[PDB]
Amino acid sequence: STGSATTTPIDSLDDAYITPVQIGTPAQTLNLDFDTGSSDLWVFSSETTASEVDGQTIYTPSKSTTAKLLSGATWSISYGDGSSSSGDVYTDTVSVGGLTVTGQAVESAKKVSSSFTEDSTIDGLLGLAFSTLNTVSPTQQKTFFDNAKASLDSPVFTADLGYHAPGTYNFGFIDTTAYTGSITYTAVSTKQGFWEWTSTGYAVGSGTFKSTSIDGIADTGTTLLYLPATVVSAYWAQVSGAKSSSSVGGYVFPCSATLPSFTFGVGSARIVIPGDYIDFGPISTGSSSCFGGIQSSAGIGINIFGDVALKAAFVVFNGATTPTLGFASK
Template sequence: MHSSLYFTLTLCFATLLALAAPSSKSGIQKRSFIVKRVASPRLKARDGVEEMAKAFNKYNIPVPRDLKNAVEKRQLKKRQLAAANRVGKRSVSQRGPQRRDDMGGEQNVRLGLAASSSQRRSQLAHQRRDSMGGDQDVRLGLAASMGQRRSLHPRQDQDPAAEQTAATQQPAAEAQAGNQTQSKAQGGDQNGSVEATPEKNDAEYLAPVKIGGQELVLDFDTGSSDLWVFNTQLKNQQPQQPGLQTGGQSAQQSAQQAGQLEKAIDSHTLYNPQQSQTFKEVPGLQFKISYGDGSGAQGTVGMDIVEVGGVQAEQAVQLATSVTGSFLQDSKNNGLMGLAFSKINTVKPEKQKTFFESVMPSLQEPVFTADLRRNATGAYEFGTIDRSKFQGDMVFTPVNNSQGFWQFTSERFAVGDGQPQQATAGGQAIADTGTTLILADKNIVQGYYSQVQGAQNNKEVGGVTIPCNQQLPDLMLAVGDNMARVTGDQINFAPIEDGSAECFGGIQAVPPGTMGIYGDIFFKSNFVAFQGGSNGQGPSLGFAQHA
């Protein structure tokens, strides 16, 4: 009897163990399968390669072949992960065609994934030409001489007759509103500030803006002059399939692309002009911005009350009806606040003032400042210079705004506390909060990295890389007749891949004859003031070391 009872208990215990053991058909195994298909966070995160290519494309500078190849490899890997992710979802859910794919990266939203191998080859070939510079290298090549340097403007499709600036002619949007742009206060007493929050790797700094009382987070960009936003009109946008014939798309593919586009748009905060009591539609005005990588925005224009940190003005607001490329994928960014000069505003037939130009007469001081910090919240402030934010004296340099930028001479540099060295004579640069890296004269880049042990021109990533554990010297850059310090710790941008011992350098070279672009790497070392000019004085740029 005891043996029978022992046998029964043993059998029950074994049965319980078997039930507790994971089964190939268990939910745990299914969840594990899905997790393995999730796209790598490394590929979704921004890195130096993408940021460098983004800056080149922003200004339609021909993309070097090695950088072009590096970006294509990353995009190919994204597409492969997207395809594997869809296969995994279909095998698990049996609903593959109906599932939205949010792992496809920007190319899947803009282009979709071709159904056949022949379509896929056609798609990739077209993307290489349009998105990565290809044929544009000949079409958009820069003049070799400094005197013939072409503008760094995005392609605007602007008529020559429309080059008249908003500063010298009343914009049509303001005329439609019935008066010149009116600010909240006419006594010159406005000032205010907003926080500037960095995304991963300080790829961009985003700040809140109220338009018609609705708050959106925008990228403040001193390298452009358009205030354009994601808005409810985008609900009518149709998927675009560059390089593919619409007739070759199956209904299933079209539905998938429409779903991806809808999801990308819904991930943004949308401004709704119909919910604004102060919005005024302005018929006849339109804008179109396109960059070298195929991304861009276009749409209509209206007037509304725009407020930044309590500073407000009635302002032209560009309402995108179509947005493509990386703008769609950056769900935290709901548009651009351009803070350069209206000469490069893309609204047709008449250019519009920037927000700073609109509020400048009503500010305590005709100035705004950029206080950007590494991996920390900074601020943009209008109407005053907070002297507690910097140390020592702030020095100012006259700005040449003839091309629409905060442009200055930069023809000298020094490494650490060494003697100043000559870069290209007459070299020019612009201050651009909308660019992540510093893109500088080749002589500056070569002279700096020659003093960094282990630095190399890495063809695999299309730029200079450095050992991540290398202590870097400071770099001194000429801003007019003054020298600005960029601390070495800011120049070590980020690993080229997660876990890599090689890091992408925060300073990279531009082609000969191209103006330098001093982006956020520069700003993270310096408190910068953008002085609009007054009392007969032109605009100027001030800087000092962070406090």
């Protein structure tokens, strides 16, 4: 089998991407944030504290003839950005772009943190990291990809995120028309539950490529590109007027600037992020200071190849017996 669904930026800045997902019988369509950096499929629901729902579409398990409460099961998650959610668990039928898993764990939120409430466009998350990170207790549950993998034509999914435009998540096949050149595959460590790989280096604009190993995760659920302080300093040093701002929380630059591209290495291959992809607009409404899309990971403990990086590439999440990651230009 295969599945294919269109993913769309939630706003003008590509802060996140949402993909329609069908849950239950009859189908309830919710727009979920596909997150290769986590492993829980959780949704706003008829059980979510009413004060914490503000425009999201909710899953109502009582209206699904295939929903079954998973007895005694609870979940609770906290994300790197400080947001949080928790609740109980059902199993139900879940379909993405024509691909169906029966008995998928659907984590129904009883509580969400303020940032989730404040984002009316995201009805929940669909985690696509490794199931070892799933938070359901006392019996850990599998991700949608893990449950679907054996049925797929090929045990892979692909992320093809658009810049200010729609894109595609495919399951079970590689669309050879969706990229230029070849796909370069690179090793993955699953030891921390992430799609963790080692970039071979970077360049800033037309500058000399620096060969250096950068360990990081491919995370579609993180907006920005978080890299070591030395690398980020070298990038922003090329932007007239750019500075690290303690009050704003990262590197900012004059909105009148044209940004240089950023290249990262994948083996011997190179992925070029256009400079415009690094502009995240005014720091506050009407400001002429703009927020940078490349920021330091120093306060994280891991580098994060988030949407800024991933949207510049066609990305293969290869769930073969030994997982690997593939990147192609596009």
